[PDB]
């Protein structure tokens, strides 16, 4: 019998889709595919890392269901992706969030039975980051799992993303391209594959009005999930080829192309990914190279958004 | 390399999950399992006859993108499966859906680039039925797929959703609980299963307030996809054991419950068909039998209704 124990085992095994229509439109010569992160349990990329920080910190004995209070900061999915897991183990959860975030982000919080404090928007992520700080030092038998920090989440994408796609590829993917919130799916991702394959690129994807991955200041950006204004303990910046900075107006239009023309319905930061994976897929030197595109979470969660909304 | 060609080919094959908390809560003998129908891509079952349908239609000649106007009456997620189908392949759709049906139905319509008609709340599905008739009567190369008639629609479940439920469960279920919307989904697990398993039960649901599989009359209820007010054609009552009846409050309750003590985030339908296996599960007769229920969809979709607002 092939039946779950619980929902935390159905986490990750997405699958790779190719695009259709807009390669061709943008007259791309590579091949651009898309992992579909939108088809985990709670329809983004962060039920991996809820998983498996979770069940580290578990392992170690440092967190116990009748005792732990769970407390993250959060843009709004790895906060799902832990109440989700904190509501399968029994978990106390306590979210930081900024409120610029999508109000669905606050209402799927609140649906699986997690608190949450919203922090001030001109604050953006460190606002949030402070004050779990604040709850964690205070707070008797309170636990961060610190997700810009904690070596399991790198380490579930090397272990099950980077797999599936060297899996799925048959070994022949060229290039990944994926935005950087924690930074860990693109660095788990270069880990395992580069060993394996040389000349494969890892490219980042960060906003372009927060662009600290490229050296640059950080600043207010609609591209929720990416651009945390900080380069996370993380991320590795040796193992990544390069970062593409992108507007807010082309993350908001690929991701409306997403849904509309490829049937696709993709948070924006996926649009983020697809209009940086159409400039590198254009450059003469990928014709007919395979590149994998992380879309990092389902667009339902941004209806209420300037995506759709209107 | 397994990369598919398109979002529809990627529907159905979704995975069985335990409950761990419920049913140990109510005294249930039995052993209840859930299919989660909210890893569709687009988060319900009806992604599975979306495909179908339209595959169907294509493959005889019926409809083309280049000119037809599909046009559906729905309560929300076949219209969403349709309007997913339709973005990918470059159809024009339209759909009709009663105005009581959550906002986050509307919302994933427009996003995907489907044309909406709302229909007056008192009417029903009734009321939306009409009109979608009245479109396509009038409309040159407007085409309805049925979805209360298509044979498509429980062919589909015969050939995927019950071959899942029989190769999952190794051929050992023996009961299994379905909210009946369109019918298909039961009714496609009854065809297909109880040739192989002659004691095999399959068990509808429907609302206490509209129990018309049950020989009642219709009326208005809160169990958003199930109780369409009439038996749909598609629907064999000589392959169904029984009809469970459900109130909109115990459907309310359960459906609150899976996201919180089971971490399975739901539709109000889940939280009907978890009530009934509950009954169910608790009969004597029922001990040590295992019970697949249905989880039609994913709760993202039903934040802004009485299941979560508030
Ligand atoms: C986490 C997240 C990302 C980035 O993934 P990391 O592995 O954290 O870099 C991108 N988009 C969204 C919407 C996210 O929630
Ligand atoms: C369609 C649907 C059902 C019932 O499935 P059928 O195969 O149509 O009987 C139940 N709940 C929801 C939310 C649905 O969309």
């Given at each position: ?51 498996s ?69 001109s ?29 399991a ?41 580069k ?56 993350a ?7 849904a ?51």
């Amino acid at each position: 019998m092939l039946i779950a124990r619980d929902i935390t085992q159905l986490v990750g095994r997405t699958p790779l889709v190719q695009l259709n229509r807009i390669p061709v439109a943008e007259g791309v010569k590579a091949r651009i595919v898309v992992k579909l992160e939108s088809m985990n349990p709670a329809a983004s990329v962060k039920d991996r890392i809820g998983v498996s920080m979770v069940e580290d910190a578990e392992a170690a004995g440092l967190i116990h269901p009748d005792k732990t209070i769970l407390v993250e900061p959060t843009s709004g999915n790895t906060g799902i992706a832990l109440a989700m897991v904190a509501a399968a183990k029994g978990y106390r959860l306590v979210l930081t969030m900024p409120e610029t975030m999508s109000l669905e982000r606050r209402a799927m919080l609140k649906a699986y039975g997690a608190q949450l404090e919203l922090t001030p928007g001109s604050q953006g992520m460190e606002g949030a980051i402070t004050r779990a700080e604040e709850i964690v030092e205070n707070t008797p038998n309170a636990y961060s799992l610190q997700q810009f920090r904690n070596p399991a989440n790198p380490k579930i994408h090397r272990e099950t993303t980077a797999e599936e796609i060297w899996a799925d590829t048959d070994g022949l993917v060229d290039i990944v391209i994926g935005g950087v919130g924690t930074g860990g799916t693109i660095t788990g991702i270069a880990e395992t594959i580069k060993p394996r394959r040389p000349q494969f690129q890892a490219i980042a994807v960060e906003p372009s009005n927060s662009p600290v991955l490229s050296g640059g200041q950080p600043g207010p950006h609609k591209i929720q999930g990416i651009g945390a204004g900080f380069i996370p303990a993380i991320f590795r910046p040796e193992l990544i080829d390069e970062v593409i900075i992108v507007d807010d107006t082309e993350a908001f239009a690929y991701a409306r192309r997403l849904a509309r023309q490829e049937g696709l319905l993709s948070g924006i930061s996926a649009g983020a990914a697809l209009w940086a994976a159409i400039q590198v897929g254009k450059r003469p030197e990928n014709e007919d190279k395979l590149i994998v595109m992380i879309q990092p979470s389902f667009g339902e969660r941004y209806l209420s958004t300037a995506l759709f909304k209107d």
